[PDB]
Ligand binder design. Structure first.
Ligand SMILES: [Co+2]
Ligand SMILES: [Co+2]
Ligand SMILES: [Fe+2]
Ligand SMILES: [Fe+2]
Lengths: 305, 314
């Protein structure tokens, strides 16, 4: 009745339950895979995604939000297959993931034309299916807010205003891209509480994280396990600090795990690391179950309502 | 047998006949087309491509070389359908068309791993078929020779050295990228005669063009009809001058026609001020008649359109 799900009837936000807000079943570069299909093994990809998702569900995860969009190899049919094999609630999105320029398709195309693509996926369905997009994903990274990155951001704001679906972002935690995304969306009329600024858990700069939260958006502590960006124990210290300072109303936690899509870079990276390490860490440091529920149930409910 | 053809037995290069060295049956952004198929009408693309190819064949064209590769929507199965509807000799390629950065697949991958993809397409076949690639296509434009652009350039060198297929380039005629491409490839051991430096017809700077040709490479006068890069009359004037100064044996001419393109610019849609007479047969309607009435004999026309493509693929 409000949040579309891959391969199922849409649900009211009250039924989302325990959510992993940012996880990927599979990512790839569309052009590479179309051109050199011998590099990929779909059977293996499917088997690893299904296993990872089953494991999450054994810890009580009900819904996964998967922000694989254009540029990351969104495949709605693969997603459907995983949903049939697992029973997971899966929220698919629309959007564009670029760091510099858009594909040449977009040359002399307006922001509204871009937004029309997102709205098509939200109102009509994704890739020829009746599976509808539940959110818009956008990105910026080390190159910053380029001209084309900015067009995409503005297009996301149009789609949100027209359809009410929330916006998930990718940012670089160390160069202000997050704060800029929030600002441009917000200036374009997006409710700050319909934005999740992503990858803030990549830094232990608490003042920058709070800045974005205090402007009204969710803060993505969303790469647990990617030690190369920030080690688990430092993420844990940051999370705990934010909870202790009263920020659990804006915290969202996830792994950004690539289910099929490393001893030094990400030794215990998986879709269940927060059950194995983070949540027990927090509980040992005095965080109650009510806070856990706020982060993994209440916050996603608010984001999608 | 020595040039692979899509949907046909390979041909000796001496049999290639009258050739258009750089034309596209269809181009698109793979990511866009994968994510928003509602934007594209395959029927219309197929009908347009077939119509263009048949009209080129009526003018005597035997062979078309199509440098649509990764980044431009190469689709060997579409190409097969076009061959089967027309009987054209079609040469498909491999390569990577980027202006700035490689797709994220290539993060922390070596130049060799890039080359192996090219070698795969040339020795094994394209996209799971046995249609083999006959050349490598690479690109550089306004952003210049970026690090990833250079990785692709060096990958093409390795592929040529291993398989012997020639290299076609896309360049920006106004920023030296063509000469940079030639430089880096010749440094890596590629024979200059196996390189076509593209889009040099986009300038009337005759001295730049000549510099590349004197270094031993073919020069692509290859966007006839794309008036936004350079109008037909200035292209014709440049082409003629090069032929008079003795450069016939290095000149290749084409239209770079996109029988179907997905960009919004779209150089011919309510916007045919950018490319009014642009089609795959414009050289038969304008350029060849112009050369012929300005002292260029049938021999020189045969050199450009038959002999040079034959050498390039030998
Ligand atoms: Co991200
Ligand atoms: Co080109
Ligand atoms: Fe992600
Ligand atoms: Fe081209």
């Amino acid at each position: 009745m409000r949040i579309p799900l891959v391969g199922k009837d849409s649900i009211e936000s009250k039924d989302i339950g325990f959510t992993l807000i940012h996880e990927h079943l599979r990512v790839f570069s569309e052009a590479v895979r179309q051109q050199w299909p011998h590099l990929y093994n779909e059977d293996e990809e499917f088997r690893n995604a299904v296993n990872e998702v089953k494991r999450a569900m054994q810890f009580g995860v009900k819904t996964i939000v998967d922000p694989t969009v254009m540029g990351l190899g969104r495949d709605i049919r693969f997603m459907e297959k995983v949903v049939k094999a697992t029973g997971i609630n899966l929220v698919a999105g629309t959007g564009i993931y670029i760091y510099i320029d858009l594909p040449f398709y977009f040359l002399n195309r307006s922001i509204d034309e871009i937004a029309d693509l997102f709205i098509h996926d939200i109102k009509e369905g994704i890739q020829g299916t009746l599976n509808k997009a539940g959110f818009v994903k956008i990105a910026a990274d080390e190159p910053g807010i380029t001209k084309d990155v900015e067009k995409v951001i503005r297009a996301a704001a149009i789609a949100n205003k027209e359809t009410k679906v929330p916006i998930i972002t990718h940012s670089n935690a160390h160069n202000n891209t997050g704060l800029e995304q929030q600002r441009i969306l917000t200036e374009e009329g997006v409710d700050p509480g319909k934005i999740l600024i992503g990858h803030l858990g990549d830094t232990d700069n608490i003042d920058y994280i709070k800045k974005i939260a205090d402007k009204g958006s969710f803060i993505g502590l969303d790469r647990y396990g990617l030690d190369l960006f920030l080690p688990v124990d430092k993420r844990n210290e940051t999370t705990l600090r934010l909870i202790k300072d009263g920020y659990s109303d804006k915290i969202m936690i996830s792994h950004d795990y690539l289910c099929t899509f490393k001893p030094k870079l990400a030794p215990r990276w998986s879709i269940t690391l927060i059950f194995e390490d983070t949540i027990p860490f927090l509980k040992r440091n005095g965080v109650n179950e009510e806070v856990i529920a706020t982060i993994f149930k209440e916050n996603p409910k608010k984001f999608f309502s």
